[PDB]
Structure 1
Amino acid sequence: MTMDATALPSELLVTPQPLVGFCGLDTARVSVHKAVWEAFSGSLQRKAADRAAVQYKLLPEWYHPKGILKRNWMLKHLHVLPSVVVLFQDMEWNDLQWTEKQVQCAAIVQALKNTLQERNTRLCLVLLQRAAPLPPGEDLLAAERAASLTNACGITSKMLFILPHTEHLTGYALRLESAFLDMAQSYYALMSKRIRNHRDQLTAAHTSLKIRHQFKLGFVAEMRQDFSTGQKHYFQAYANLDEIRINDGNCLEIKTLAGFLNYKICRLMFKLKTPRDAINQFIIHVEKHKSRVGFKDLAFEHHAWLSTQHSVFAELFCEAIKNGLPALQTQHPGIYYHKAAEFVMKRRDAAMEAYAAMQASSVAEQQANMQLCDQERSYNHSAAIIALLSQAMAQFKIYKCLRFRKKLAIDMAEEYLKSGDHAKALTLYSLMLPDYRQEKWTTIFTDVLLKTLRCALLSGSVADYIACSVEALSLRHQSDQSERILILENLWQVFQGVPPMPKTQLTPEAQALWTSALANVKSVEMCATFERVQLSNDDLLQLQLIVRVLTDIPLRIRSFHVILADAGNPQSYYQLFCSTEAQQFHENTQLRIVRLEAHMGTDQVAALLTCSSN
């Protein structure tokens, strides 16, 4: 009829490769088969240029398509069914035990040809003539034993191959691979012809079976490296899907199929390096899809799948990087990494909506749809969101794009906020806030500042909390004055260590958590000036440091401190007595204080605001 091409992801993520089989071989031989398999794993030892694509696997109206009709047929074709069958055996040249070799290899090839009769596959046999090498044209018993084979089965002579000694076995394995390339491409072409002949007939114009056929056609082509032909048959299948009706119960499956198709064709793009072509196909179909659905769209569908769309395309971005293309990433390291990240954000928001529509009183299996939601309720951790953010983070960091990755970092911390996970949010914010002050732009600086307020109060890193709060009061004039007053009260509280006021948010658990704090914690702008330095060991300096408050609200005028320095030798507007210098120290030392540390109101500004000298 019109059955799905496949509902199976995680398929052929690596470059698809042929498979030729090896039978169930016992441990008794596996040791020497080790060497045997070594040559086989030699395909994985050698460079891709030397490496043959094929690998190994083990086993013990109109008429309906055979080999195409179902997606498990596709997959079983992919790896379960080898294009060619090869059974490796040993052949010691002897007299009558070698006749027993004849009978035994006859039995095994009889079983093998029965299996082939099940599944229409070409066969080859490999024999180690473990004896010493001899010239070709010497062993008539080779012909005799081939004839014993043929009367048993009829396998052609040339399909027989020999790997006498390991030092010989290696080269004979290389040419084995070459011959296998031969037969494998032969079988692949034969199946290609099968598909095209199938496609020339319609079972009463079902029109979707042929879609499966052209899909499998692309499979064949990419097996045979004709990437262009197969990718364009894929795209033609996309066109065919377009011709199909939309918005039915199928349209979601249509969208997923087109996702498969976009995946494959974009692979074949970047293999052929047609970048903007891949971009155009990507967009074209994805906005097709956004149009095609207006609802249901429970938005773990067509939104999460949108996320997976950008996920696969990011996969193909990194695939290009492994290939080495710098184009789109000089443009945008991952155009779609963070994009899929915001798509999983909308995923989670839609999940919140799902909970909302659930909070309604919540017969065509809508409960299963609700059960869908329950399934969708599972993928609500949104930690995978955080990880996708991490990949986008690193991906943009690849070309050292600090700003963008930093703002994705504040994204991460915001998400941890949404999840209620204050800790690591606070960590990333702790990194960002000095950065944001370095960007000098106070607006978002303050916005992440109140975010940090929430983060630290929830965490209880009240040292960090108050540091951000105080550099916030520095220039908090963009915010409410009364909240400045409240926060200043919080400042005196924390300096005393007594619980801070924003109990309007606080709940007792984290409250106690930070009550634990500050037992360990150990430690608006004004100006420093000098009337005289570099003295003649007679001068007397004095308070040239103008203590200015740029906060509208005052801080309680408590007290003062000055800290002595040792270079060379050891020795609105509010001003009050300090007599900072009356100690007649030694000459030519400019004691410029690291930080002010006078006791106005409380200890200090601590967060790194102190000037040098005159």
Structure 2
Amino acid sequence: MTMDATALPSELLVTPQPLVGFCGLDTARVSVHKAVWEAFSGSLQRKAADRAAVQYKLLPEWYHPKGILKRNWMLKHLHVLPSVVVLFQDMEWNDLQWTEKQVQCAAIVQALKNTLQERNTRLCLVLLQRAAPLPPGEDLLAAERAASLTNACGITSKMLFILPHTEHLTGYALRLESAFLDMAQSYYALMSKRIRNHRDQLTAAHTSLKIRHQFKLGFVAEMRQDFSTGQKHYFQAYANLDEIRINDGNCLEIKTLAGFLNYKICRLMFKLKTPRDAINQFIIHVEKHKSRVGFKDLAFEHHAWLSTQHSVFAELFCEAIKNGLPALQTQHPGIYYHKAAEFVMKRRDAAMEAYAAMQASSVAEQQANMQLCDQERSYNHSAAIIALLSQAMAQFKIYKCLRFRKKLAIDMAEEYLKSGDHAKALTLYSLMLPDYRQEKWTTIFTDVLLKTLRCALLSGSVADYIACSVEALSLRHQSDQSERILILENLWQVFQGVPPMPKTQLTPEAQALWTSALANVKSVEMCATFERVQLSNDDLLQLQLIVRVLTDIPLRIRSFHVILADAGNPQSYYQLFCSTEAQQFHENTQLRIVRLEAHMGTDQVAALLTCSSN
């Protein structure tokens, strides 16, 4: 009435299936019963369609509805009440043991039916036989047994069954499956009759009860593989939810109900091979819900639910893929993963100012908001962003997508930086520069480059630091000149061991990081100019390569080395006296330079723009 219709998150996320249960038993009877139990699970072994959909639980102002009034009654409707109960003993004709088992089985099934009457589950009686098969029509004592047991508890003869050995037990377990299915379905149809005869009446326009009735009958139809009546009922329940215009800040219960039935309807669509329907539903719903909230909006609201909603819908997509629905994938494989990811980022941000407002001051219900603040503080982990982008990246790769995986990877790296775990971030950036450099998009390339330098300096990975710095040098004309100069001087500093000057930009811990390093770390665009390739019998070659500098700020002129190329035999412009080659070797000789060995100001470039052949 005033309480919530249903409060179960992730209700029956698993495929709803028929559920038959029966009384708990000791280890030795179940030890004889083993073969029967793995005969049951052979359906799990066999293909799912060959598997009977049933499952095994193995237990030990109008007036409100019965069994429907509560969400806990509802959860009971899930599993707590199997639609079939079967009492297990062995059927064994005997002399005195026969009578003893008669008396005891009669009494126990008597209590069992005393339990089962109100819950209306019918109690079918199936008994094991290890003895030789009985020819029907031969034993009149079997007839007396049937009479006595049937009159013991009112369970009819047809309900009674016999459990033979495996070669027959297989087919008879299967026909048992069929009978259990039939009587469960009869139960479910009856229970739906209950629902409908309740539905005819109304509690003077509450319609929450109506939603409960549709949702219960959704259980029923989903359960019975109808897949249709339930989804119609879900549609109608959601509609009547809508006609309930929001009274007040209690939009959250509405949104939760919406998400529940929304999952239900979408997945039921996916069961029915109606992807377009599902897509339109989920969009319609999510922007409806975006428009839903106006206030409070404690920034818990609209963020967590929306992210979870996208999450669930991508999960439904994956369910569809498991089914085999590629119509939705060929358009876009991992649609809502990274929308959910951006929503959880927004959620962390919202948490930031939620904190901030909590520092403002903190007479009714306010303590609840306080525990809310604390609980979302628990949520400040935001590794969920990482997981969501992980799934998004995988799914994007699934349809041969590189850049969305590449951009969400930059998002991963940047949140790693917010995570502080700059190491993984620099690993990502290290992988991500090459593709940007091939891509030539000169805008983005420097934009990621400055962040990559930031990661290198914080990490103290001086090798990557210098490499990305020198590639920035090669074409740094987009940025300001003095910054180029500072980069270069920091580079020389670190080649000869001096820490970089942005000391306030650095922290003592990172100081330790890169003071520690360089123990293993060892060893502007210009051109190689060879005057004479394909050497003849006698010649000489001097400094003809021309070291053009694209950077404005000059490279300091101290030294340089060129390593004599092994091709064949092992051996503002600045033109100078270096002039290595002055000797004679064998003819038909060519040359090709690995790296600059740039000892001008720096020791060496460590980045391969020392072209071999232009």
Greater CA deviation, 375-384 or 578-587? Answer: 578-587
Residues of 2 paired with 1:120 and 1:328: CA distance? 43
The CA deviation string for residues 380-421 of structure 1, in whole angstroms up to 9 with x for no partner, is: 110111111101011111122111101110010011112222
Q: Is this contact kept in 2: 1:18–1:54, CA < 8 A?
A: yes
Specify the alignment match of 1:45 in structure 2: 45
TM-score with structure 1 setting the length:
0.97
Specify the alignment match of 1:107 in structure 2: 107
The CA deviation string for residues 431-489 of structure 1, in whole angstroms up to 9 with x for no partner, is: 11122112112222111111112212221112112211111121111111111111111
Q: Is this contact kept in 1: 2:120–2:187, CA < 8 A?
A: no
TM superposition shift of 1:2: 4.5
Counterparts in 2 of 1:568 and 1:48: CA distance versus 1, 3 Å: same
TM superposition shift of 1:42: 2.1
Counterparts in 2 of 1:539 and 1:205: CA distance versus 1, 3 Å: same
Greater CA deviation, 500-509 or 342-351? Answer: 500-509
Counterparts in 2 of 1:247 and 1:341: CA distance versus 1, 3 Å: farther
The CA deviation string for residues 342-371 of structure 1, in whole angstroms up to 9 with x for no partner, is: 111101110111111112122221221122
Residues of 2 paired with 1:197 and 1:178: CA distance? 29
Residues of 2 paired with 1:159 and 1:583: CA distance? 107
The CA deviation string for residues 504-530 of structure 1, in whole angstroms up to 9 with x for no partner, is: 321101211221111111231111132
Q: Is this contact kept in 1: 2:249–2:295, CA < 8 A?
A: no
Residues of 1 paired with 2:503 and 2:181: CA distance? 74
Q: Is this contact kept in 1: 2:19–2:83, CA < 8 A?
A: yes
Q: Is this contact kept in 1: 2:249–2:296, CA < 8 A?
A: no
Residues of 1 paired with 2:145 and 2:513: CA distance? 84
TM superposition shift of 1:93: 2.0
Counterparts in 2 of 1:394 and 1:353: CA distance versus 1, 3 Å: same
Residues of 2 paired with 1:142 and 1:430: CA distance? 81
The CA deviation string for residues 91-140 of structure 1, in whole angstroms up to 9 with x for no partner, is: 12222211112112112212211221352211111111211123333333
Cα RMSD after superposing both structures: 1.5
Q: Is this contact kept in 2: 1:556–1:600, CA < 8 A?
A: yes
Secondary structure in 2 matching 1:286: helix
Greater CA deviation, 349-358 or 28-37? Answer: 28-37
Counterparts in 2 of 1:521 and 1:100: CA distance versus 1, 3 Å: same
The CA deviation string for residues 235-287 of structure 1, in whole angstroms up to 9 with x for no partner, is: 11110100112151331110110000110000011111211211111111211
Residues of 1 paired with 2:295 and 2:539: CA distance? 83
Residues of 2 paired with 1:11 and 1:141: CA distance? 50
Q: Is this contact kept in 2: 1:22–1:59, CA < 8 A?
A: yes
TM superposition shift of 1:162: 1.4
Residues of 2 paired with 1:485 and 1:93: CA distance? 101
Q: Is this contact kept in 1: 2:298–2:354, CA < 8 A?
A: yes
TM superposition shift of 1:73: 0.9
Residues of 2 paired with 1:53 and 1:506: CA distance? 63
Counterparts in 2 of 1:613 and 1:459: CA distance versus 1, 3 Å: closer
Residues of 1 paired with 2:32 and 2:65: CA distance? 42
Secondary structure in 2 matching 1:336: helix
* 1:613 paired to 2:604: no
TM superposition shift of 1:148: 1.7
Secondary structure in 2 matching 1:124: strand
Q: Is this contact kept in 2: 1:247–1:293, CA < 8 A?
A: no
Q: Is this contact kept in 1: 2:314–2:337, CA < 8 A?
A: yes
TM superposition shift of 1:301: 2.0
Gaps of 5+ in 1: none
Specify the alignment match of 1:599 in structure 2: 599
Greater CA deviation, 178-187 or 564-573? Answer: 564-573
The CA deviation string for residues 314-362 of structure 1, in whole angstroms up to 9 with x for no partner, is: 0011111111111222211111011101111101110111111112122
Gaps of 5+ in 2: none
Residues of 1 paired with 2:247 and 2:548: CA distance? 68
Q: Is this contact kept in 2: 1:93–1:129, CA < 8 A?
A: no
Specify the alignment match of 1:86 in structure 2: 86
Q: Is this contact kept in 1: 2:523–2:604, CA < 8 A?
A: no
The CA deviation string for residues 139-181 of structure 1, in whole angstroms up to 9 with x for no partner, is: 3333322222222210011111111212221111111111111
Q: Is this contact kept in 1: 2:495–2:602, CA < 8 A?
A: yes
TM superposition shift of 1:538: 1.1
TM superposition shift of 1:302: 1.8
TM superposition shift of 1:233: 0.8
Counterparts in 2 of 1:114 and 1:464: CA distance versus 1, 3 Å: same
4+ runs deviating over 6 angstroms: none
Greater CA deviation, 534-543 or 219-228? Answer: 534-543
Secondary structure in 2 matching 1:158: coil
Specify the alignment match of 2:243 in structure 1: 243
TM superposition shift of 1:227: 1.1
TM superposition shift of 1:43: 2.6
Q: Is this contact kept in 2: 1:93–1:131, CA < 8 A?
A: no
* 1:204 paired to 2:207: no
Counterparts in 2 of 1:289 and 1:109: CA distance versus 1, 3 Å: same
Secondary structure in 2 matching 1:85: strand
Secondary structure in 1 matching 2:600: coil
Q: Is this contact kept in 1: 2:338–2:389, CA < 8 A?
A: yes
Q: Is this contact kept in 1: 2:598–2:605, CA < 8 A?
A: no
Residues of 1 paired with 2:115 and 2:444: CA distance? 70
Counterparts in 2 of 1:326 and 1:480: CA distance versus 1, 3 Å: same
Greater CA deviation, 270-279 or 131-140? Answer: 131-140
Counterparts in 2 of 1:487 and 1:361: CA distance versus 1, 3 Å: same
Counterparts in 2 of 1:554 and 1:568: CA distance versus 1, 3 Å: closer
Q: Is this contact kept in 2: 1:490–1:500, CA < 8 A?
A: yes
TM superposition shift of 1:537: 2.6
Secondary structure in 1 matching 2:314: helix
Q: Is this contact kept in 2: 1:214–1:233, CA < 8 A?
A: yes
Q: Percent identity over the alignment?
A: 100
Residues of 1 paired with 2:55 and 2:540: CA distance? 88
Q: Is this contact kept in 2: 1:235–1:265, CA < 8 A?
A: yes
TM-score with structure 2 setting the length:
0.97
Residues of 2 paired with 1:328 and 1:187: CA distance? 38
Secondary structure in 2 matching 1:77: helix
Q: Is this contact kept in 2: 1:124–1:159, CA < 8 A?
A: yes
Q: How many residues align?
A: 614
